[PDB]
C-alpha cells in the first residue's frame, strides 16, 4: 500500500500547523506523507521552532505555505486546527475526509503556551495513529 496523505491546515501556517507537521513526520512517517498550510502565511513562529527544539525536532527547515489545490485533491485526510481554517477551508473533493482538531492559538503568549499546545498536538497525533 502507498503512503496516505494528511494535510494540516491553520490560520497562518506558523505555529499549530507547523508543530503538527513536525510531530506528524516523526509519528506518522511510516505510513503517511505530511503537509501543512494556512489561510495566510506568517512564516514559522520563532517560539514554535524553540518548542520543537526542546523535543529534539527541527522545524526551522519548514516553509509557511498557502493551501494548495493539488495537495487537497490527493489528501486522504484534511485536519483543520482552528475556526478560521475550518470555516475558510476551500471546498474539498467529494471523497476527501475532513476533521477538526481545535487547538488554542499560542501567538503573543509565553514560551509555556507553545509547550502546552505542542504537547496537546502530540497526543492527538499519537492517538490518531492508533485508531
Ligand atoms: K508547510
Resolution in A: 1.8
Domains in the chain: how many in total? 1
Closest alpha carbon to 121 in 18, 1, 5, 11: 18
Distance 18 CA to ligand 1 centre (A): 7
Distance from C-alpha of 8 to C-alpha of 24, rounded to nearest angstrom: 9
Q: Residue length, the chain?
A: 131
Distance from C-alpha of 79 to C-alpha of 23, rounded to nearest angstrom: 14
Interacting residues of 22 by C-beta distance below 8 A, sequence separation 6+: 52, 57, 58, 59, 62
CATH number assigned to the domain comprising residue 34: 3.40.50.2300
Using what technique was this structure determined?
X-ray
The DSSP symbol for 129 reads: H
Asked whether 74 and 97 are in contact (CB, 8 A), the reply is: no
Distance 79 CA to ligand 1 centre (A): 13
Distance from C-alpha of 36 to C-alpha of 63, rounded to nearest angstrom: 9
Asked whether 64 and 14 are in contact (CB, 8 A), the reply is: yes
Distance from C-alpha of 92 to C-alpha of 125, rounded to nearest angstrom: 22
Distance 27 CA to ligand 1 centre (A): 17
Distance from C-alpha of 99 to C-alpha of 110, rounded to nearest angstrom: 28
What strand order describes the sheet that includes 4-10? 32-38, 4-10, 77-80, 97-100
Distance 25 CA to ligand 1 centre (A): 12
Closest alpha carbon to 34 in 54, 56, 19, 55: 19
Alpha-carbon separation of residue 128 from 98, 101, 106, 124, 125 (angstroms): 13, 11, 22, 6, 5
Where residue 13 falls (left for φ over 0; alpha for ψ -120 to 50; beta otherwise) is left
Range of the domain at 113: 1-131
Distance 61 CA to ligand 1 centre (A): 10
Place of cell 502507498: 2
Extract the C-alpha cell encoding 22. Answer: 513536525
Distance from C-alpha of 62 to C-alpha of 69, rounded to nearest angstrom: 19
Amino acid at each position: 500500500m502507498d503512503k496516505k496523505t494528511i494535510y494540516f491546515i491553520s490560520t497562518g501556517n506558523s505555529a499549530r500547523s507547523q508543530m503538527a507537521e513536525g510531530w506528524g513526520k516523526e509519528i506518522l512517517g511510516e505510513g503517511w506523507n505530511v503537509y501543512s498550510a494556512g489561510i495566510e502565511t506568517h512564516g514559522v513562529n520563532p517560539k514554535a521552532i524553540e518548542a520543537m527544539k526542546e523535543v529534539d525536532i527541527d522545524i526551522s527547515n519548514h516553509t509557511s505555505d498557502l493551501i494548495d489545490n493539488d495537495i487537497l485533491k490527493q489528501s486522504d485526510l484534511v485536519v483543520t486546527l482552528c475556526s478560521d481554517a475550518d470555516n475558510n477551508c476551500p471546498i474539498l473533493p467529494p471523497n476527501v475526509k475532513k476533521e477538526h482538531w481545535g487547538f488554542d492559538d499560542p501567538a503573543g503568549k509565553e514560551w509555556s503556551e507553545f509547550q502546552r499546545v505542542r504537547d496537546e498536538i502530540k497526543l492527538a497525533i499519537e492517538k490518531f495513529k492508533l485508531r
